[PDB]
Amino acid sequence: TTALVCDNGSGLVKAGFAGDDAPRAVFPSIVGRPRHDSYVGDEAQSKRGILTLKYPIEHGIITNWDDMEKIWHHTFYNELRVAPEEHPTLLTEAPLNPKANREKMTQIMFETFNVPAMYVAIQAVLSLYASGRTTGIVLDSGDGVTHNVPIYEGYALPHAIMRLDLAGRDLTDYLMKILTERGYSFVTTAEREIVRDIKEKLCYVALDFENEMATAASSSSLEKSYELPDGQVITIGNERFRCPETLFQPSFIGMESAGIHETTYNSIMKCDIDIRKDLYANNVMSGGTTMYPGIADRMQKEITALAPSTMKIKIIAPPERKYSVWIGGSILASLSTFQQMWITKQEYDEAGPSIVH
Amino acid sequence: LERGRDYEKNKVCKEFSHLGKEDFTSLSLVLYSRKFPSGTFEQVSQLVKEVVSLTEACCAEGADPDCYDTRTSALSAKSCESNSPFPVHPGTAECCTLCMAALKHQPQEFPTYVEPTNDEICEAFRKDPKEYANQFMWEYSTNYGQAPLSLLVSYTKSYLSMVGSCCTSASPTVCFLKERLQLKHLSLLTTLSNRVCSQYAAYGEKKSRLSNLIKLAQKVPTADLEDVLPLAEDITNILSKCCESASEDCMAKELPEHTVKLCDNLSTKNSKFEDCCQEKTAMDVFVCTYFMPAAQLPELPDVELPTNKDNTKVMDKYTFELSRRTHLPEVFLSKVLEPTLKSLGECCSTTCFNAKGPLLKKELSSFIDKGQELCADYSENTFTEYKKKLAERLKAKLPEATPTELAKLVNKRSDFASNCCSINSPPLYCDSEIDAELKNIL
Numbered sequence: 001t002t003a004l005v006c007d008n009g010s011g012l013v014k015a016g017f018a019g020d021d022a023p024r025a026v027f028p029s030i031v032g033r034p035r036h037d038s039y040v041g042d043e044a045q046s047k048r049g050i051l052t053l054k055y056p057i058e059h060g061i062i063t064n065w066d067d068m069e070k071i072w073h074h075t076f077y078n079e080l081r082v083a084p085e086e087h088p089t090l091l092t093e094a095p096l097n098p099k100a101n102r103e104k105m106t107q108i109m110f111e112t113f114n115v116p117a118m119y120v121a122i123q124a125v126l127s128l129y130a131s132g133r134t135t136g137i138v139l140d141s142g143d144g145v146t147h148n149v150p151i152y153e154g155y156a157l158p159h160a161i162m163r164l165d166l167a168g169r170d171l172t173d174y175l176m177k178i179l180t181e182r183g184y185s186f187v188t189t190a191e192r193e194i195v196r197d198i199k200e201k202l203c204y205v206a207l208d209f210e211n212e213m214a215t216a217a218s219s220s221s222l223e224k225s226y227e228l229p230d231g232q233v234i235t236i237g238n239e240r241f242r243c244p245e246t247l248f249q250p251s252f253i254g255m256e257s258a259g260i261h262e263t264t265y266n267s268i269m270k271c272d273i274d275i276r277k278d279l280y281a282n283n284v285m286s287g288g289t290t291m292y293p294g295i296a297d298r299m300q301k302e303i304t305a306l307a308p309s310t311m312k313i314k315i316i317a318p319p320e321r322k323y324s325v326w327i328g329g330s331i332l333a334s335l336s337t338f339q340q341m342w343i344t345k346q347e348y349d350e351a352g353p354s355i356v357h
Numbered sequence: 358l359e360r361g362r363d364y365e366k367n368k369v370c371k372e373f374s375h376l377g378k379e380d381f382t383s384l385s386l387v388l389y390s391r392k393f394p395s396g397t398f399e400q401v402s403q404l405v406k407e408v409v410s411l412t413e414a415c416c417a418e419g420a421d422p423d424c425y426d427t428r429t430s431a432l433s434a435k436s437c438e439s440n441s442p443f444p445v446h447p448g449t450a451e452c453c454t455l456c457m458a459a460l461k462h463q464p465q466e467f468p469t470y471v472e473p474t475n476d477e478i479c480e481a482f483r484k485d486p487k488e489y490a491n492q493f494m495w496e497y498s499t500n501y502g503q504a505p506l507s508l509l510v511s512y513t514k515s516y517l518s519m520v521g522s523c524c525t526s527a528s529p530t531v532c533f534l535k536e537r538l539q540l541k542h543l544s545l546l547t548t549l550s551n552r553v554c555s556q557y558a559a560y561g562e563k564k565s566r567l568s569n570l571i572k573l574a575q576k577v578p579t580a581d582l583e584d585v586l587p588l589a590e591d592i593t594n595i596l597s598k599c600c601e602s603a604s605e606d607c608m609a610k611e612l613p614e615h616t617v618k619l620c621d622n623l624s625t626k627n628s629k630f631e632d633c634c635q636e637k638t639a640m641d642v643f644v645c646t647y648f649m650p651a652a653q654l655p656e657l658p659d660v661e662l663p664t665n666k667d668n669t670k671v672m673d674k675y676t677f678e679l680s681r682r683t684h685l686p687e688v689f690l691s692k693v694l695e696p697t698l699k700s701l702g703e704c705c706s707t708t709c710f711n712a713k714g715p716l717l718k719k720e721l722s723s724f725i726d727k728g729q730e731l732c733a734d735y736s737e738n739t740f741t742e743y744k745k746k747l748a749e750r751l752k753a754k755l756p757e758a759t760p761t762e763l764a765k766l767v768n769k770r771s772d773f774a775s776n777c778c779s780i781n782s783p784p785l786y787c788d789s790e791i792d793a794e795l796k797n798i799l
């Protein structure tokens with residue numbers, strides 16, 4: 001159980017110990033270097049004006065290994081303060097992470113960090129595990145990518161996984177844009193931080209979009225005041241729900257792709273007719289970008305308008321879904337029956353990195 | 358040697374004594390539920406109540422030697438009352454004048470059972486444990502009745518042992534993850550055996566064989582007949598043997614062993630199969646290979662429909678070759694290849710294959726083209742994208758159709774495709790819809 005659990009996210013890394021109920025360390029996935037030695041996380045972000053920030057994980061997939069190693073080293077020694085060679089380590093990966101990518105993670109872990117053992121789990125599958133279920137369809141929306149992953153008794157159907165290259169940062173960028181069209185001005189790194197805060201506190205998904213627009217144009221019953229750090233007080237109106245509406249309508253940011261209600265529906269339709277009922281009735285939502293109030297209700301409505309009239313639709317969106325993935329790892333890594341699922345250093349020293357599968 | 362005149366009696370009494378009244382009642386609830394898939398919860402609970410009564414009485418020490426055979430007949434008598442409180446097999450009436458001992462019930466291709474959330478499960482278990490357990494054994498067994506009885510009893514038993522154990526745990530959610538993972542093996546074995554057995558029951562051994570060869574050919578198009586034919590034949594044999602066998606080991610043993618052969622022979626022929634075979638246990642592999650979609654077909658020159666003089670290896674070869682190069686779902690191929698080989702066969706003498714050959718070749722060619730149109734675009738696009746293109750298709754072919762009408766045809770066609778254009782589409786249902794769809798083909 002004394003294993004480590006590290007959820008390598010596009011925007012945030014969630015690290016802790018198997019068994020805890022929440023990540024002990026949550027820092028931005030960033031590696032910066034002096035503009036003209038090496039910093040990670042918050043600090044590297046703070047000293048931005050004199051460094052070169054780099055994101056090792058763009059859309060869920062680790063793209064730059066040298067930087068990733070820095071994140072892992074920082075995760076172990078600075079954030080958790082432990083010896084990686086003394087703790088089995090469980091790492092997470094995106095839904096369709098390439099085999100070669102996984103093997104490279106496994107190699108670095110054993111050879112560079114000397115972990116006694118490790119495991120790589122599909123993020124979405126852990127979110128499902130967190131709710132104590134092994135079958136259902138997960139909608140995972142984080143910082144840089146959104147996925148729909150159908151799962152049957154622990155098996156993720158690769159051919160039914162749906163993706164949408166739109167998540168949290170795009171929503172933040174988009175809220176900045178429409179807030180600026182309203183008269184305010186949000187364009188700098190700093191103002192971005194203010195908009196992300198506005199996004200996470202005042203935004204919500206409208207059950208019925210067009211009607212909500214009408215209500216915002218008809219009255220001020222939807223307005224909300226927000227105090228800037230300097231005291232200025234602005235009002236957020238229809239941008240409260242217009243921002244999140246982008247998830248169901250990617251066209252708001254010029255993306256001609258299906259919204260999350262359709263990605264969920266498409267994903268289910270890729271599965272055999274006899275198991276779709278168990279996807280519809282176990283639609284789990286996870287990730288920071290599924291935190292919007294009213295999103296579960298909006299999804300339940302959309303899917304109901306798409307599924308057969310006799311189909312039971314149930315959305316599972318817990319209050320702590322922001323860390324569902326990490327939590328599913330903490331639980332799975334603590335199970336006594338999972339201890340034989342680890343990959344030992346002895347085993348690794350056999351078929352090399354091509355052992356993690 | 359023939360089973361004793363009282364093979365049944367001695368069997369039930371032996372079970373009633375080894376399990377006690379409670380567990381024998383459960384065994385019976387499961388048994389009569391799978392036997393009567395359409396039976397309401399009360400018709401089956403009522404019958405089960407009668408069965409357990411007779412059994413207790415007729416198995417009692419000093420019981421009249423005619424008792425069991427007398428009561429069971431008074432049980433069948435009640436099953437003919439019209440206003441009977443017991444279930445009834447299709448046309449059980451055309452027998453009420455002993456066919457009511459072993460009548461057939463078709464497989465369930467669209468199970469409705471939906472496991473409730475953990476919260477709902479525990480909410481109903483608290484209210485009434487016995488009730489919950491009974492309602493569950495009924496609905497599950499009526500929905501997955503084609504799985505062997507021993508598998509159903511074993512699964513429903515372990516599942517209930519999980520609910521009682523996790524709903525009273527300090528960490529329900531944590532317990533459910535642990536218990537559900539340990540239950541995975543049996544759960545997979547149970548639900549998957551029901552599905553493969555329902556297909557087998559619908560097809561019959563001959564069609565089933567053909568069906569499994571077609572499906573294996575579509576999953577591994579770049580394989581050799583010798584690589585798959587033995588496998589397709591292996592599963593068919595396991596199906597005819599284990600689907601209806603009291604041997605509480607047949608399926609449980611055979612199925613995992615089939616998966617090992619599947620991997621030994623196919624592991625190194627496809628990226629997808631390699632992935633499937635890397636799974637931890639047999640059932641994890643079987644679920645992967647079972648769900649594996651028809652692959653992108655190689656696309657080679659047309660294949661010739663054998664019509665010479667000719668064991669049975671030429672038609673197998675042809676099936677294999679045709680399916681591996683024809684983008685048409687297995688339910689279509691199985692549907693047309695059956696009455697196509699029935700014609701070629703009833704031909705053999707040589708003059709025959711000369712007047713029918715061209716006849717069968719054309720209809721088959723026409724059939725294949727019809728299906729490709731009914732299933733066009735379905736496999737290559739997400740469903741919502743398929744519906745768009747479909748509307749684009751039907752529009753430019755029905756200029757006078759009103760937007761409303763157009764959308765009605767779109768819905769009907771896409772509805773058909775979502776049910777009959779994938780690798781594991783339901784045989785019974787699709788065989789009837791395919792006929793209907795072809796007539797409306799346009």
Ligand SMILES: Nc1ncnc2c1ncn2[C@@H]1O[C@H](COP(=O)(O)OP(=O)(O)OP(=O)(O)O)[C@@H](O)[C@H]1O
Nearest residue numbers: 009010011012142143144145168200287288289291
């Ligand atoms: N309450 C909230 N309302 C809206 N957005 C939120 C909320 N809390 C967090 N977010 C957004 O969630 C994102 C971070 O979520 P998360 O940690 O799930 O992503 P990630 O795992 O790092 O990314 P990925 O899964 O794509 O690799 C940010 O854009 C953040 O603003």
Ligand SMILES: [Mg+2]
Nearest residue numbers: 009010142287
């Ligand atoms: Mg994430």
